[PDB]
Amino acid sequence: KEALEIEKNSRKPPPYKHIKANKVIGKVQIQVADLSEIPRCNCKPADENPCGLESECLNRMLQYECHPQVCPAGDRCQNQCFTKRLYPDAEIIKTERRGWGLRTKRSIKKGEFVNEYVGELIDEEECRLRIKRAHENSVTNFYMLTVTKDRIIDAGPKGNYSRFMNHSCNPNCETQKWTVNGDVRVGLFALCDIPAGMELTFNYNLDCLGRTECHCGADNCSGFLG
């Protein structure tokens, strides 16, 4: 008769549409630069690792992605991460107290691009409506991230593997706001070297708009999510 035996471990996460890039919703509009507006860095195509993590790259320093038609380095440019969508291979995992999570299948170096946070791009009003409807339906998983005050990415209905990354108070990745072809997008970047097999986490820096309990396990855990 066991309450322990009532095995309701979902064998798979609830459905979502796995998408490559953000999808604008309602009033939210498409932001695209003219090729004439893309910043050009001063890296040289002869450089070792042109526009790389260790480089002086003026674009990378200001979190601007290079456009290959613009960059002096051509297709050798190592600052095309968002557009190339080269992500370390990742795997969805089941946790006991934090739902589904995500782990890396390979080793990742400090500062390396891990993923793009993609989803439906919605305005504040739509964000609030969605949160209200979620509370009315006793939903406890939220996938909303503010890019700017009226541009919020909702990775709930549609997203990529980044939607599975859990919150940690002592994370191994962080979000950064980058400009890519005149649009503001959100990347996840490693804060440290990460061995293959490790769960990938970031600090949500949550604006709660009461608190949810945090199970991240960190020594500095506040006890509360975000």
Partner: peptide, 5 residues
């Protein structure tokens, strides 16, 4: 709540 960068 909503995540922030």
């Amino acid at each position: 709540g909503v995540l922030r960068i």
